[PDB]
Amino acid sequence: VQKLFVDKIREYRTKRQTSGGPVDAGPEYQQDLDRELFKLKQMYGKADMNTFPNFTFEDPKFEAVEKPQS
Template identity: 55%
Template structure:
């Protein structure tokens, strides 16, 4: 009988502790979020980043890019195209190896 009461008491204690922990974890998450929002420098920094991101999306590129920036960008793109053989620099290059089929044929013949 005492053993039965001990098991019953332990299950009640376990459920009370789990409810308390669950409540404290939920409360600490809310407090942490509020504490994070209280830092004015961090909030201002994130607001400016979000504002710049929104303006860049509406502008369709770099926000507040002047003619000097555009000129520098086109010069650098021209240098890269000349250095890497032209073409579209946003696509992965297609590699062509002449005579590769002959080498693969020789390897497969030697394996047989």
């Protein structure tokens, strides 16, 4: 069916004329890609784009031992 071989490539080239993502999204693709974009961040964490690690650690304080001896 090479007449069908040409007819699924030629209506693939029409999909390669794109402006803003989906062609017939409407309220469908706008809600779904925003529902999924939250879920990759919801149970994952709150993370910005480029912020480095900012913290500070304190070690164990070295106490002394009192000892009258001999």
